[PDB]
Every structure is written in C-alpha cells, then in structure tokens.
Design a protein around this ligand. Structure first.
Ligand SMILES: *[C@@H]1O[C@H](CO)[C@@H](O[C@@H]2O[C@H](CO)[C@@H](O)[C@H](O)[C@H]2NC(C)=O)[C@H](O)[C@H]1NC(C)=O
Ligand SMILES: *[C@@H]1O[C@H](CO)[C@@H](O[C@@H]2O[C@H](CO)[C@@H](O)[C@H](O)[C@H]2NC(C)=O)[C@H](O)[C@H]1NC(C)=O
Ligand SMILES: *[C@@H]1O[C@H](CO)[C@@H](O[C@@H]2O[C@H](CO)[C@@H](O)[C@H](O)[C@H]2NC(C)=O)[C@H](O)[C@H]1NC(C)=O
Ligand SMILES: *[C@@H]1O[C@H](CO)[C@@H](O)[C@H](O)[C@H]1NC(C)=O
Ligand SMILES: OC[C@@H]1[C@H](O)[C@H](O)[C@]2(O)CC[C@H]1N2
Ligand SMILES: [Ca+2]
Ligand code: NI
Length: 641
C-alpha cells in the first residue's frame, strides 16, 4: 500500500559500490586490440562517470598462468626469480579505469598460481610466506610501475582458504607498508569463513570483508553476527540479453534487502572473449570483434547505471527498504548531504533468471506504489526520474521531474512488470551516447601474423587466446630469420584452478570455420622428447579445453608425427616417421576440407587423404606437447565458414 521512507531512527548499512570482474579467465582478451575510437568508447561505457555503467569497483584476476574459464592469464612471476609487471592486460585495464574514475576501487584475486610456488605440489599453502610474497609483490608492482593502489586482496577464488595463510598475508602486507590494503575472504561460500571469524578473534581482526559468490540474494546468520561488511563478491554470469539485465536488476536491489550485502560484483566486466568459449556473452556488455570494431552496449550497462550514476561508495542505505506488495523491491540511499536515491525493480521470474541459483516461481503483477518521505527527507520538493522497460524495450530514459510540493512528502506511480525507476535528488544523470560502431563481421577468412613487433603494447600477439600454457612475443637477437616469434613460456604445470590440458594450446579465429588451411613455422626447444602441433576444427576451450576434438598435426623431436582427433591424443587418424629434430625451424601446413585432411612438412606432403570426422567445425590452434618451450612464426590461416 503505502511505503514509508525515513531516516529519523537512523540509517542502514553503508553502501560499498557496484563493480565487475575482468578475469577468471581472459574475459578481456579481445578488448585490447580494438582500434580507436571504439576501444576508448567501450571503456567510457564501463567507467566514465555519469555516462554508462559508471562502475564503482573494478576487480581483476591476478594471473597465475593456469586456465581460469575462458583462457589463461599471464603471471608476474612465471619462474622463480622472474619478475615482470607488464604482462597481460589487467594493468592496462586498471589504468584506463583510473583515468576515467580516479575514485574507482581496485581489487585483485588469484585463480591459479605458477607451479613453482607449490615446490612439487599443486597446492599454494605448502609455503605460506612464499605465496604471500608472490601476492604482495603483485600489489607492490601495481604501485611502483603503474601508480595503482590496490584496495582489496582476496585469497583463492572459489577454493579453500587457509587461516594461517590469511594471517601471514596480513603480516606480509604490513611488513611492506601496505596497511591500507584490505583483505576479503574467502570468495567462495558463506562457510567455512563466516563461522571461522566467530571462533578465531585473530582471524576476525585481519579479515575486513566477507565475500561470497552467487549467494542467491541471501546470507547466513554467522555472517550477520560477525559485524563484517558482506559482499556478493561475484554474481551475474548470465547472458547479457534482456534476461541477464533482469537478473542484474533484481539482485542489485535484493542482495542488500534479503542478504545485507552492500556490494555486488558481476562476472564479467565485458564479453571480450570468443562466444563459443564457456559462458559466452556473460559480460555487462559485448566487445568480441576487435577486427571489425563492432561492440554492443547491452542492457546490463543501463541496468547498472540505474544504481551507479545515483549512488557512490560511502552513501548509506536507509532502514526502510523492502519488497513490494505484488512483486519487486525497492532500496533507498542518502549521502548525508540532503540527497536521496530510490531504486525500484519489478523483474518478473520468467525474465530475470540468473544461472546460479535458479529461483522457484514468484509472482509479479501490476500495482500502485505510494511512497512517503519522513525524517530528514521531509523537504525535497522535486525528484528526477529515470526509467527502463526490459523486453522491444526502452533503456535509461529520463522522464519529467516529479514534484512533492503538495506538503505531504508523498507521491505514487503505476508500476508494471519488468521495470526500473530511479528517483533521485541528484541532477548529474546522463545516458551517454557515441555514434553506432561498425556492423558485426566474422573473423577474417584470410589472416596472418608474422609476430614482427619490436616493442609490443601487450605481451601477446592479438586474437591468440591461450587455453593452456602462455604464449608471448619473443625476441631472439642471436637469429635474423626468426628474430620476432611467438613463444610458449611455461615449463611446468601451474597450480591449476581448472583441469588444464596436458598440452599447451592457443586458439584463434572463427569457431564456425569448417574448411581451413593452417600454416605456421614451429621450433621445438627440448631435444629428443619435445613436440608441437598445429590444429583446426578445435571445438571446445576454456574450462572444457581438455575435451577439445578437431584435427591435430603433431611432430616430435624423436623423428615422428601423429595426426589425432583429440587434444589428448587418444584417437589416431594417422602416424608415422618424419625428418624432424629439435632446435630447427619447420613449416607445418594442415589442410582440412570435408571428410579429408592433409599435412605438409616444409611444403612437401607428409600425409594426405586421411579420413577425419565430418561435419566438424572449430578454431585454428597452435601448441606444444607438454609444458615446454617452443616457438612459432609466420602464422597463416585461410578458412571457409
Ligand atoms: C540484515 O537484513 C535483515 C533483513 O534482510 C535484517 O532483518 C530483520 O528484518 C526484518 C524484516 O526483514 C525486520 O523487521 C527486523 O527489524 C530486522 N532485524 C533487526 C534487528 O532490525 C537485519 O537486521 C539485518 N542485519 C544487520 C543489518 O546486521
Ligand atoms: C547532493 O550531492 C552533491 C554532490 O555530492 C552535493 O554537492 C556538492 O556539495 C559539496 C559539499 O556538500 C561541495 O563541496 C561540492 O562542490 C558539491 N558538488 C556538486 C557537483 O554540486 C549536494 O550538496 C548534495 N545535496 C543536494 C541537496 O543536492
Ligand atoms: C567444406 O568442404 C565440403 C567438402 O568439399 C563441402 O561440401 C560439399 O559442397 C559441395 C558444393 O556446396 C557439394 O556439391 C558436395 O556434395 C559437398 N560435400 C560434402 C561431403 O558435404 C562444404 O560445403 C564446405 N563448406 C564450406 C563452408 O566451405
Ligand atoms: C499472480 O497474482 C494475480 C493477482 O492475485 C493472480 O490473478 C494470478 O493468477 C497470479 N499468478 C500466478 C501464476 O500465481
Ligand atoms: O559462472 C562461472 C563463474 C566464472 O567462471 C568465474 O571464473 C568463477 O570464479 C568460477 C565459476 C564462476 N565464478
Ligand atoms: Ca617473425
Ligand atoms: Ni560448436
């Protein structure tokens, strides 16, 4: 009926901000080679204040060289004694975010770890000081090399925590003058972290925020008792159609209302990874075509704006928030300066499903909502109105100001299903607009890269999406013909988050490709036991990279070759001997058309008219037999979709 909004009995919890995740894993991979101005425009839609999603929080993966959902991300310490703070693209992304929003909040969190941290075990808690040292060096490097202040450091994404590790991490941060860095734990479920904090005063002292993943808007009693800030430190992960916007809309309000969570952070920030990788197009917007410049400002961007443009971290929720009589919810916030923001959502069940969890049916129907401003809100003769209707549709439209000048501090509105209203004293709102970007286009059907770049802007050549191992631009000054190559740089299995393959692999191109010729120069660095491959029709990647089938053309340093149907090498198409050794360059060609494949070694047929599965489709790929050094040069692909 009537809903009272008031602050005379005090405020709710402090609001900590809305954010998104770049990482877990390689979700921003394809953003870095967007041409200008589109790349800058994408970033404006994400981070520019009073424009698009206007995000308050950016959380990034701390790469550990393992597969972490849509690819690998490179570590700052590939090996013991190795330190490099310029690999990958999270440094670049954090700086671009800070340029747009100097007050953006920065978080880092590991998914995988370089294998050498485990000292012979796939376990990061073998040497607590060593793992803490590794993580803290990332934070120091962020400051020393990029002028980035990391505000929050997590533990181990969706993996066990170790209470002694968390304490050592606090001790190490303090030892390095990083008292201001806060710890969030444990980026998994509410338990066991929540009860651990009630039982261990020392643990309680060093954990600042309980961060839980996909809580379905609820928390648990132990977490409320702790007194700690509670965050949905990872949510969303739903395709960014209108359904995902509805999911984002509902949980943004109800994570606080139902579970006292004062921050929600969406996985992921932007869908800049091939769509047929796991969880495709599950970013706040889509930018997965750097070759064309095409991107899509999806509905979740404007759902975000309904909160972010009219709140800031440090505002406070009112005590008077809740659900509507006939479905939906409302929150309200103030900044203690006379501003008020009211956010109303009526997302229907059929149109707001997240992937995790699935809610049983709830009803939503037309209703009239009356709001009355009591307490300090009593003045406020006017409020600005921003409106979105999902599903068709209209996004983030500014409507006529509502006037409360009748002395009652009261208004009403006709709500229907799947709407968002933001009513605010703030006058800074804006629906940012750039002109439309180029039309969508498939990955180029002829594509080449000679890797000849002496000072690359990023550590890896464009469009190559590593799915196990790490491939990087490599300069060999002791050579003239292959001075600039692409090298696989892992020499041992990471402490894995995913089930990384036993072979390294980087995929590129158009997943719909069915007939293709792939060519590449390859160089095997390990004598006798080394091996490399080129492939096509590679059908799976990311978390499922172990499952990948296709056509794989292997050569080995013992003078042999293999043609397999699977990355694991269990299914043989052909095999035989080849004039192949380590430490010399060979040019591999693989042609796949219809039912048949052929392979050439240095332009001479090695095997031909070999029967392969068909129909079949997938990316092109390169890689190495195990975690071993190898180089690649003069990559070429021609394909038909
Ligand atoms: C966390 O939020 C819950 C609600 O989601 C608060 O719970 C009680 O909620 C009912 C109705 O939902 C109110 O009538 C009670 O007054 C609330 N309890 C109290 C003590 O006020 C709960 O208070 C919140 N916990 C915090 C802020 O620590
Ligand atoms: C609403 O918010 C704005 C921005 O936070 C407030 O205006 C600022 O007020 C502070 C002092 O309170 C000044 O130092 C800033 O220069 C102001 N900035 C802008 C952009 O105006 C405003 O006071 C708040 N209250 C109301 C009723 O608007
Ligand atoms: C990929 O290659 C196969 C084999 O050449 C193509 O299939 C043939 O297409 C022709 C003309 O379209 C037909 O007359 C044949 O009967 C097809 N054969 C088979 C076995 O399908 C296929 O169309 C090609 N696809 C692309 C996208 O180029
Ligand atoms: C939802 O509520 C309305 C109003 O009470 C009712 O008419 C309608 O049948 C309900 N729908 C479901 C699926 O419960
Ligand atoms: O929905 C998938 C999500 C994504 O893959 C993130 O990497 C993760 O941390 C791991 C699973 C979940 N959260
Ligand atoms: Ca080269
Ligand atoms: Ni497919």
């Amino acid at each position: 009926g009537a809903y009272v909004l008031d602050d005379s009995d005090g405020l709710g919890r402090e609001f900590d901000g809305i954010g998104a995740v770049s990482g877990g894993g390689a979700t921003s991979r394809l953003l870095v080679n967007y041409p200008e101005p589109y790349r800058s425009e994408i970033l404006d839609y994400l981070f520019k204040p009073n424009f698009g999603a206007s995000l308050h929080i950016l959380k990034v993966e701390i790469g550990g060289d393992g597969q972490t959902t849509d690819g690998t991300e490179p570590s700052h310490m590939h090996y013991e004694l190795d330190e490099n703070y310029f690999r990958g693209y999270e440094w670049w992304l954090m700086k671009e975010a800070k340029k747009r929003n100097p007050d953006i909040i920065l978080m880092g969190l590991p998914w995988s770890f370089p294998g050498w941290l485990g000292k012979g075990f796939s376990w990061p808690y073998v040497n607590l000081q060593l793992t803490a040292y590794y993580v803290v060096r990332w934070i120091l490097g962020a400051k020393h090399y990029h002028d980035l202040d990391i505000d929050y450091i997590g533990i181990w994404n969706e993996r066990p925590f170790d209470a002694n590790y968390i304490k050592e991490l606090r001790k190490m941060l303090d030892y390095q003058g990083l008292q201001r860095v806060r710890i969030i734990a444990s980026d998994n479920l509410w338990e066991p972290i929540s009860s651990s904090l009630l039982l261990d005063q020392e643990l309680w002292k060093v954990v600042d925020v309980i961060g839980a993943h996909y809580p379905g808007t609820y928390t648990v009693w132990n977490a409320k008792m702790s007194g700690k800030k509670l965050w949905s430190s990872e949510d969303f992960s739903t395709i960014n159609s209108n359904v995902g916007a509805g999911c984002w809309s509902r949980i943004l309000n109800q994570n606080y209302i139902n579970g006292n969570m004062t921050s929600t952070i969406a996985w992921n920030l932007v869908a800049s990874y091939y769509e047929e990788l796991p969880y495709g197009r599950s970013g706040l917007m889509t930018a997965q075509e750097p070759w064309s410049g095409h991107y899509v400002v999806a509905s979740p961007i404007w759902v975000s704006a309904h909160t972010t443009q009219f709140t800031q971290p440090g505002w406070y929720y009112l005590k008077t928030v809740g659900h509507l009589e006939k479905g939906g919810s409302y929150v309200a916030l103030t900044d203690g300066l006379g501003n008020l923001t009211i956010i109303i959502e009526t997302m229907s069940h059929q149109h707001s499903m997240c992937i995790r969890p699935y809610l049983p049916y709830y009803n939503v129907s037309h209703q009239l909502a009356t709001f009355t401003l009591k307490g300090s809100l009593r003045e406020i003769q006017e409020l600005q109105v921003w409106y979105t209707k999902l599903g068709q549709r209209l996004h983030f439209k500014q409507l006529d100001t509502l006037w409360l000048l009748d002395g009652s501090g009261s208004f009403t509105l006709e709500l229907e299903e799947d709407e968002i209203f933001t009513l605010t004293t703030l006058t800074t709102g804006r629906k940012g607009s750039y002109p439309p970007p180029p039309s969508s286009k498939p990955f180029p059907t002829n594509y080449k890269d000679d890797f000849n770049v002496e000072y690359p802007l990023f550590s890896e050549a464009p469009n190559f999406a590593d799915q196990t191992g790490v491939f990087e631009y490599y300069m060999n000054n002791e050579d003239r013909e292959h001075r600039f190559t692409l090298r696989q740089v892992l020499n041992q299995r990471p402490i894995t988050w995913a089930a990384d393959a036993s072979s390294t692999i980087s995929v590129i191109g158009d997943h719909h490709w069915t007939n293709m010729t792939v060519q590449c120069d390859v160089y095997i660095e390990t004598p006798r036991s080394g091996g490399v491959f080129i492939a096509g029709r590679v059908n799976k990647g990311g978390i499922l990279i172990r499952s990948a089938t296709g056509v794989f053309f292997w050569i080995f340093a013992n003078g042999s070759y293999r043609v397999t149907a699977d990355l694991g090498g269990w299914i043989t198409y052909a095999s035989g001997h080849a004039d192949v050794t380590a430490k010399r360059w060979y040019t591999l060609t693989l042609g796949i058309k219809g039912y048949f494949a052929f392979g050439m070694l240095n332009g001479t047929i090695l095997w031909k008219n070999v029967r392969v599965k068909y129909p079949g489709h997938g990316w092109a790929a390169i890689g190495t037999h195990t975690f071993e050094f190898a180089q690649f040069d003069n990559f070429r692909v021609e394909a038909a979709r």
